[model samples]
Target: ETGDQRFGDLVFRQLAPNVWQHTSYLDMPGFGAVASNGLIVRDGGRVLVVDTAWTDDQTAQILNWIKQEINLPVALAVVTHAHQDKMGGMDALHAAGIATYANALSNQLAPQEGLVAAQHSLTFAANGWVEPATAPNFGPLKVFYPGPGHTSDNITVGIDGTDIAFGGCLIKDSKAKSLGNLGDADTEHYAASARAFGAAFPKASMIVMSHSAPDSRAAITHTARMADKL
Candidate 1:
């Protein structure tokens, strides 16, 4: 068994073949310590990392493990949104000369919100903006933008050849009864956005959110239902 590995406060655990979940803790300004989850998928001898850690050092740890332990090169890093939990470590990624991509809106909104201007600046300079509506496919990964829910720039990813869906913050945990941390949410449109996600990947056997145990597709249904109340 490939047991859970720790990189500082961030932990990595394999959920399915070639699919690992990496979770990092963030010391938010008012929220104290919060854990954020991302995906590490090994496809065709290379790796695709979906979302960064809470800081550059944390990201470096992740990169080191990939290089030393897995011996696989990270071909791309996809930031699911502009939030610090998802994109904060992008600066370290850029410093390591790794290509990073995110929704065009994430690239724009990140800097505007003063989340991480340096990373966004590097992103624009490198032409790393991904058009949301295009539904670009990268090898086995398909990036899908189902409108805005948790944030205006949120997006989800589907891995082909497997029934895995990375819902980011747009999909909540099974235990979540509310929309969760809606400081940047569009309450008026969140429900519709989640519904869009549900319709787009109706057959997802496993759904992973930013702060939950990756398991059932019921998380999407829960998120949609909670959003409906707002």
Candidate 2:
């Protein structure tokens, strides 16, 4: 790893005015926990966190940063994937009284022996954990289960106001020059998942993944071309 910190050259930057992306990658070993990047959708009324990082500490820091940087109510929290690294802190978020959301499939698979068991690591992830619910309305946002890619429970979080979409681990940085590993992914359905995402948000200009940088229309164009090669 680089072993240097400086927001990784502002790799953590605000995509929109109130919407910010923060990465807490201290999860990377020999270095620290590698920061997983997620978004903060803040408006005057309510604020939302896209996904939390790997550990409880990192997720806690993310919440603190939100409180420090902006002043508003965190109305909702969305876990784009059912993986522990992303949703591990769901229990904590729920306890804070923030409405937590997941795709219908993720919500179901989260507590099941189906997808979560087969693909996830039992060591760092909580197997018998139950997340808290902040509120009932999972609106102002739409969650789409785009089928199997990074996991069968992969979902897309789309904000209606900003029209910004979080691809979870479904979409990789086109500039990455290579496909992300299929650790939790099914190779057979990977390509189709990408296509499904493309079709799901045909007009979305912003796409955020769990890692790497945010992809814009230019990045999307690049991602499309790269997908053709894959």
Candidate 3:
């Protein structure tokens, strides 16, 4: 059954048969509480996580929920970016002994973002991802770094047997009026990355946005269009 046992501020909602959206909120001084979205993918004998909550305390909730509810061991985790909202729970995951991965560049930038670097990484080179997390290390659930968009190391996640794709901050929400934040963006190269992103998960019908609700495939196309204008 879907999560009927939900409690606390971190909640998990079903998106697909085996994909759940894990949402946690952070209270920004002036903005009040803002939610960040991530994914929980159930594979064979293990579960995979995409991104984490905005803080370690919240992430501990995620782990507890997975332990009591899902009842499956979290085999692997991938942080879509180096931002606080994406990797802030890194310490909790490591404390829980979960295997974590991130883009090489993302790992390099984590400390500066006041976040912990992932333990493992997919290589980045020539301005693009040379090695993306795939089978054995991570499967059914895959993480690919298309290039640089919201951040130079932002990556996207997808499920092998499903159309579900977690775009994180790299793909914009349909309601987004702008690219959101550009403090660490590789503006000039975003278009190429968008195209690459679209090509990688071209027909993903269910696309997830880190700061917004889940959307359809059209949202990915919409993001590509916006990147073109940037």
Index of the highest-lDDT prediction: 3
Backbone clash pairs for candidate 1 read: none
For 122-171, candidate 2 gives per-residue lDDT tens digits of: 11112211222322454445556666777877767676667677777777
Index of the highest-TM-score prediction = 3
**TM-score for all predictions?**
0.87, 0.74, 0.91
lDDT of 3 by residue, 115-222 (tens): 899998777545443454322467686667788789988888777799888888888877678888888998898878876876788778888889888888767778
Per-prediction CA RMSD (Å): 4.4, 7.6, 2.5
User: 169 in model 2: Cα distance from truth in Å?
Assistant: 0.6
Off by over 4 Å in 3: 1-6, 124-135
lDDT of 1 by residue, 11-102 (tens): 88887788888888878698698888898889878888889988899999888878876798888788888888888898888888877777
Ranking by TM-score: 3, 1, 2
Minimal lDDT window, size 10, model 2: 120-129
* Candidate 2 deviant stretches above 4 angstroms: 1-12, 30-33, 111-139, 217-230
